[PDB]
Task: inverse folding
């Protein structure tokens, strides 16, 4: 029943789902410590949020931003996807 | 050109059909062991300095030769999907 | 087959006191022709080295009993003053042409092989003139004129070929 | 060997120095050969007088200039990547407004390159070239209006690039217009600025052109003299104060803008000649006494109302016309850039006066080589003009040494507007070889100069021409200008002559660039020779007169791509320029004077001149060519031999006995073979490869430098981190590979450390010949920063013609080499002597180039007659004479057959039998004569050799001249399967031990898509590239004898999915019925 793919969906991603496909949240800009070539805790290369570096680029994490932000694409794109949505000055 | 290539095209309802058929049987010939043939008696493919081309020459080269004879049968939904590698691996070592 | 010069590393060099460069002489060498006097002389190597102003003739070589050189006048090179002429001329009796980079003769670590120039045949031609005798005029009179470098005389070459032929004719024995 | 030339025309004055184009150009440019006493001017000196008189009070002028002490000799610079310059000093003093001081201390500013004996330059270790350039001699010109057939438009353009483009357009609606910096304005205004008053203006102006009221209109503004200038400025877009800031104006005074070209020709020409008369100053200058005088505006317009009205002399100048197109030789180009640095130098001295600490400064305080030197180094190494000296062989360089192009500084010719200049113009006649242009794009944009044609005082390529009084030919000649040429009636050199007078009454001649028939009475001049019509590159073709200009162009350039074969052979047929070529080319060396031979060493040549002296000459054994080839000198003399001044000492790279020899004259039997000579395929007898006929020497310069990283400098040594000894054997020295070693693909030549050793790149290497290093203690080398040391490895090998070899003829017939049948079954002549090369006749028709067919026949006689021939371009041998000598040859080929005691062959019967049935032989005649008469046609019987059965029908034979080209099979032989990968993306790129698989491109894919090879295609886009998983997965299956892996999802698929996820994009993969689908 593993029927090959024939359909591809493209739509906005809800914050909830954001965590869905997320396996851990890095909350520190600590790439890799210089003493040990091993990543620094919940850094951009932790072995728990992503995975082993030996016998890892198929697992994603997230950054629960403090205060909500915005996906520039839905505001800066020619037709203000959201601006025109609320009548607000599309670009201004 | 290739052996009775024409006779082949005439057996299929579409050029591309042949290809997919030749390829599928070609694999089953090597993976499922090289003894699934149906024309092994005589007129079987041969080599040169040593006519040892009686065991493992080239996949497709055999596949087509098999279709040369209306011994086999093909279609869209002939035999159940999964029931494929099940009846084949058990019947052949 | 190959040569090794004392004061040389590569065939693209030149020796002091020596007029013609390496490649120049090497070429004048293959132009040489020799004659063995026994089926054993499968591999022979001569040597020569003169000094001061003089024409380097092939004859100046050191005679090696059996093997003989039918190419005396061959002007190989010339030495100005105190020309350090030293070499190692490997000679073999093979067949036909053979790439210098196909056999790779290494008589010495810094020696460079050459190309095969056997086939003691300059040019051959056959004339199929009319007849001379016989009550029939629709006959032939084959007559061939051959030229040899010196190794083997026309006759020699003749018999050989004719024989190679004969022998070949037997291969058509065991059917299938 | 015998030498017969069919020269009917009395070639008066020999060919001038084929290199004088670059030679004198540099000489006169920088007057250095003679002391500053012989105060020339033009070039260097003139450059000084120009921006030297500096006054801001700053008062420093020029005194004397000298220099020329090359730090290192030629070779040194080459191998040491050094720059062949020359210390440039300068003597100048300073005088104050307060009487006193005369400080003149030797002040030098940077060094300048020099021109080689051959006429090249050695910038940085490499030899380059300063190609000439064309353009429109900055002058006055009138040409019709754009898309309006109405009136016309005047144009003035005084270079350098710092010269404003002024134009005069006649606006019909009223008033004349003057275009400058994209803006039109009433010329009147300016005229007033010059002093031209209303009355004096109109009168002496529009006295004939009622249109005058189109400028004598200003009765409100043209009533204010000097005030006009204030207004003129108001025109300038900028909003600057209307004060005395007469800047922009003064700019067009006597300084730079108006071309400061020679006061007499450069500018005066387009002046006096076209319009006006005398040239006050050097350009439209004179800014003294406040007012301005310009005897330029009056004329330019006086000529305008002239053509727009009566017929003062039909002045509608032509564009392409060379008589208005100047050239830019090395001297001009260089001196030009020079003036740049000068102006940039003076930039400082001026500012170094405002801040000057009183009269306590003069030399250094006002000088700095920085600006000057910088410029020079920019031109000789950063200008598109200078290029890589094409040394594919002697000839090649020579051509690239005197070639010309339009493109350049930009202010002359662009790139997207010249389909007009690209075509051969009438004036190009004897000025620019019409068949010297390269192939592909840019064709026409670049094309060398003609033959005898030479540059003049200012570009304008002149040409020789025979003077004639009535019907008598004068032995005197003069280089006529492309302009003055049309003034007379020139006739051809073909014209029959009886000593010194014309022949027939109906003589051919070219009037004004137009072919006409004139009587022996109006003969003002005559062609000097067919040669001057084309350039050397073409003057080398056998019977040009029998080949199309299109196909000729091919063989022309082909000679430039020839390869210096080891066994040089001068063409069986020669144009007679081969002797001169090798000379001015400097491929070989000639004896300076008469004397006798001393030391004839394979490396050194010594001789004792009769004037009581002795000199030796360095014999460059095997030097590395710029294109990777041999450059030896074969001493063609012997110990003690009376020699004459200018005698052949040693042969050049492709020379032989003073005669050029780019290739060999092998036997040829043009006729279709077993298809082996299909399209352009060329068969060949092993016989040739036997006597090392077609072969050459190749070299490979692999360089390696010991970088100096901050992570531990790299050290050169036998130290290999992989304890490999099976490779350290040949690596004798401490890092460098032994000399005379046989390196193979993969072995190491030099050992690097941090193991970055320089291995033998893919393909081959050959046998090392010479290597040199450069430690820290630089004896005098400019070791690049961050470099501790450097090493070079000169490797080489022999190029024995094989299969992928390609060779063409001087006629333009190119073709690869298919099979090389052995002399055994090679078509032979009835009397032994087999053939050498088999060309397919099919390549003769469509390609109208009969010339070859000629050389062959001619050569067919040279084989038996044992001689070579020299046929002038169009004055070459003629059909009659040939058949004569050829017949004589028959009495040699067959003449001997007779006395030997043998007649015809039964085979020769059947052939002649079909010959008669083919109308080739006259029936009724005897076999003897039949063969003879047939031999005269250039065809002879020919036996197969394979079957012995001769080919029914004679086969035209002869000795054609062919040659191998630069393009070998070495630079092409990529065979990959498994190797490296793109460190960045994921592509099978090699470079070291393996190679890299050619690209696939969307094009090829498409076609693949068409076929429907879904899998074959998908296989190329994944399993053989990106998705590394399926790649290895596949490798296993293969080595395991299992079916190749079938990629379930290319790495590109899943990567993109999440790659989009990374930003909003909720890429959801659904199945056939709107259902989830696991991606990973």
Result:
């Amino acid at each position: 029943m593993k029927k090959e793919v024939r359909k591809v969906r493209i739509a906005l991603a809800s914050p909830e789902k954001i965590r869905s496909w997320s396996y851990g949240e890095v909350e520190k800009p600590e790439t890799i410590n210089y003493r040990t070539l091993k990543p620094e805790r919940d850094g951009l290369f932790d072995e728990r949020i992503f995975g082993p570096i030996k016998d890892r680029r198929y697992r994603m994490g997230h950054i629960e931003l403090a205060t909500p932000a915005a996906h520039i694409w839905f505001v800066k794109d020619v037709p203000s996807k959201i601006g025109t949505l609320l009548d607000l000055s599309a670009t201004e | 050109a290739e052996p009775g290539i024409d006779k082949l095209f005439g057996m299929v309802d579409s050029k591309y059909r042949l290809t997919v058929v030749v390829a599928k049987r070609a694999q089953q010939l090597l993976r499922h062991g090289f003894k699934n043939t149906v024309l092994e008696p005589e007129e079987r493919p041969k080599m040169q300095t040593l006519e040892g081309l009686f065991d493992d020459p080239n996949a497709v080269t055999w596949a087509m030769k098999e279709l040369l004879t209306g011994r086999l049968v093909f279609g869209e939904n002939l035999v159940p999907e999964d029931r494929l590698q099940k009846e084949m691996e058990r019947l052949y070592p | 087959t190959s040569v090794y010069i004392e004061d040389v590393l590569h065939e693209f060099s030149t020796i002091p006191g020596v007029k013609e460069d390496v490649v120049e002489i090497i070429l004048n060498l293959k132009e040489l022709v020799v004659r063995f006097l026994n089926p054993s002389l499968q591999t022979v190597t001569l040597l020569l080295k003169a000094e001061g102003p003089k024409e380097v003739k092939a004859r100046d070589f050191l005679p090696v009993a059996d093997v003989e050189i039918m190419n005396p006048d061959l002007h190989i090179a010339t030495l100005e003053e105190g020309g350090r002429l030293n070499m190692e001329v490997r000679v073999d009796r093979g067949v036909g042409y053979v790439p210098a980079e196909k056999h790779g003769i290494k008589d010495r670590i810094n020696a460079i092989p050459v190309d095969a120039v056997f086939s003691p045949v300059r040019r051959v031609a056959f004339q199929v003139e009319d007849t001379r005798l016989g009550q029939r005029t629709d006959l032939d009179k084959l007559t061939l004129r051959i030229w040899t470098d010196g190794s083997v005389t026309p006759l020699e070459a003749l018999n050989q070929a004719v024989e190679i032929l004969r022998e070949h004719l037997t291969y058509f024995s065991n059917p299938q | 060997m015998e030498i017969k030339r069919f020269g009917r025309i009395r070639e008066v004055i020999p060919l001038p120095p084929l290199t004088e184009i670059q030679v004198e150009s540099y000489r006169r440019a920088l007057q250095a050969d003679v002391p500053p006493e012989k105060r020339e001017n033009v070039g260097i000196q003139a450059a000084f007088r120009e921006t030297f008189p500096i006054e801001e009070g700053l008062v420093l002028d020029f005194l004397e200039y000298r220099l020329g002490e090359p730090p290192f000799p030629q070779d040194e610079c080459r191998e040491k990547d050094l720059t062949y310059q020359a210390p440039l000093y300068a003597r100048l003093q300073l005088i104050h407004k307060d009487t006193g001081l005369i400080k003149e201390d030797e002040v030098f500013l940077g060094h300048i390159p020099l021109m080689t004996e051959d006429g090249s330059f050695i910038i940085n270790g490499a030899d380059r070239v300063i190609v000439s350039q064309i353009h429109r001699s900055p002058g006055v010109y009138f040409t019709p209006d754009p898309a309006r057939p109405g009136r016309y438009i005047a144009s003035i353009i005084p270079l350098p690039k710092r010269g404003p483009w002024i134009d005069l357009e006649v606006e019909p609606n009223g008033v004349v217009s003057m275009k400058v910096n994209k803006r039109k304005f009433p010329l009147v205004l300016l005229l007033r600025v010059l002093g031209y008053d209303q009355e004096t203006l109109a009168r002496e102006l529009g006295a004939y052109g009622e249109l005058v009221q189109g400028l004598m209109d200003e009765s409100v503004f043209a009533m204010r003299p000097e005030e006009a200038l204030i207004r003129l400025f108001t025109l300038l877009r900028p909003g600057d104060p209307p004060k005395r800031d007469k800047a922009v104006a003064y700019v067009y005074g006597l300084i730079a803008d108006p071309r400061r070209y020679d006061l007499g020709e450069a500018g005066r020409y387009k002046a006096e000649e076209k319009l006006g008369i005398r040239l006050s100053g050097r350009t439209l200058a004179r800014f003294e006494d406040g007012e301005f005088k310009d005897e330029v505006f009056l004329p330019t317009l006086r000529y305008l109302f002239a053509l727009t009205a009566g017929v003062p002399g039909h002045e509608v100048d032509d564009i392409d016309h060379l008589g208005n197109r100047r050239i830019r030789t090395v001297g001009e180009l260089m001196t030009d850039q020079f003036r740049v640095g000068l102006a940039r130098l003076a930039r400082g001295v001026r500012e170094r006066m405002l801040m000057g600490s009183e009269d306590s400064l003069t030399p250094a305080k006002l000088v700095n080589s920085r600006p000057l030197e910088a410029a020079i180094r920019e031109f000789f190494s950063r200008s598109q003009l200078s290029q890589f000296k094409d040394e594919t062989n002697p000839l090649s360089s020579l051509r690239h040494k005197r070639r010309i192009s339009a493109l350049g500084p930009g202010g002359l010719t662009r790139e997207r507007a010249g389909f007009d200049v690209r075509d051969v113009h009438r004036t190009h006649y004897g000025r620019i070889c019409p068949v010297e242009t390269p192939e592909g794009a840019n064709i026409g944009l670049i094309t060398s100069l003609a033959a005898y044609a030479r540059v003049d005082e200012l570009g304008f390529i002149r040409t020789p021409y025979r003077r004639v009084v009535g019907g008598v030919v004068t032995d005197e000649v003069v280089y006529m200008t492309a302009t003055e040429e049309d003034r007379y009636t020139i006739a051809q050199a073909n014209t029959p002559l009886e000593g010194n007078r014309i022949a027939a009454e109906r003589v051919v001649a070219r009037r004004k660039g137009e072919p006409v028939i004139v009587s022996p009475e109006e003969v003002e001049f005559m062609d000097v020779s067919p040669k001057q019509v084309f350039s050397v590159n073409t003057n080398l073709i056998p019977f040009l007169e029998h080949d199309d200009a299109n196909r000729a162009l091919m063989g022309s350039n082909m000679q430039t791509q020839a390869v210096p074969l080891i066994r040089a052979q001068a063409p069986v047929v020669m144009t007679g320029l081969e002797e001169r070529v090798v000379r001015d080319s400097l491929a070989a060396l000639y004896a300076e004077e008469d004397g006798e031979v001393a030391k004839v060493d394979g490396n050194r040549i010594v001789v004792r001149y009769e004037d009581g002296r002795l000199v030796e000459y360095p014999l460059r054994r095997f030097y590395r060519s710029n294109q990777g080839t041999a450059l030896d000198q074969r001493p063609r003399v012997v110990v003690g031999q009376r020699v004459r001044k200018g005698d052949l000492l040693a042969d050049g790279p492709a020379s032989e006995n003073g005669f050029l020899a780019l290739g060999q004259n092998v036997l040829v039997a043009i006729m279709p073979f077993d298809g082996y000579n299909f399209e352009d395929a060329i068969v060949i007898s092993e016989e040739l490869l036997k006597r090392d006929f077609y072969t050459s020497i190749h070299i490979e310069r692999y360089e390696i430098e010991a970088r100096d990283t901050k992570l531990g400098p790299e050290r050169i040594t036998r130290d290999i981190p992989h304890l490999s000894e099976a490779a350290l054997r040949d690596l004798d020295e401490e890092g460098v590979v032994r000399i005379g070693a046989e390196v193979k693909p993969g072995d190491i030549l030099v050992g690097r450390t941090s193991d970055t050793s320089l291995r033998v790149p893919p393909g081959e290497g050959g046998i090392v010949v010479r290597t040199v290093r450069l430690r820290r203690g630089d004896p005098g080398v400019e070791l690049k920063p961050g470099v501790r040391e450097v090493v070079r490895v000169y490797v080489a090998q022999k190029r024995k013609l094989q299969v992928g070899d390609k060779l063409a003829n001087r006629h333009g017939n190119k073709g690869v080499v298919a099979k090389i049948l052995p002399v055994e079954d090679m078509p032979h002549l009835p009397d032994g002597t087999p053939v050498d090369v088999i060309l397919n006749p099919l390549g003769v028709p469509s390609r109208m180039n009969l010339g070859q067919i000629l050389e062959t026949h001619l050569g067919l006689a040279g084989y038996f007659l044992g001689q070579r021939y020299i046929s002038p371009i169009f004055d070459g041998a003629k059909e009659p004479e040939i058949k004569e000598l050829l017949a004589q040859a028959f009495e040699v080929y067959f003449g001997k057959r007779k006395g030997e005691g043998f007649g015809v062959d039964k085979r020769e019967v059947e052939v002649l039998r079909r010959a008669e049935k083919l109308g080739l032989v006259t029936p009724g005649k005897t076999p003897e004569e039949q063969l003879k008469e047939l031999f005269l046609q250039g065809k002879v019987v020919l036996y197969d050799g394979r079957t012995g059965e001769p080919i029914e029908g004679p086969i035209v034979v002869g000795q054609m001249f062919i040659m191998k080209l630069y393009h070998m099979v070495e630079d092409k032989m990529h065979a990959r399967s498994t190797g490296p990968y793109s460190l960045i993306t994921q592509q099978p790129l090699g470079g070291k031990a393996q190679f890299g698989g050619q690209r696939f491109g969307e094009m090829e894919v498409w076609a693949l898509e068409a076929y429907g090879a879904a899998h074959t295609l998908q296989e190329m886009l994944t399993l053989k590239s990106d998705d590394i998983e399926g790649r290895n997965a596949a490798y296993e299956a293969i080595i395991k004898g299992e079916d190749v892996p079938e990629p379930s999802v290319p790495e590109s698929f899943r990567v993109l999915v999440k790659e989009l996820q990374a930003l909003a994009l909720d890429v959801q993969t659904l199945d056939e019925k709107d259902n989830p689908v696991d991606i990973f």
About this structure: Residues 39 and 45 of chain A are 5 Å apart (CA to CA). Chain A touches chain D through 17 residues (CB under 8 Å). The longest helix of chain A spans residues 15-20.
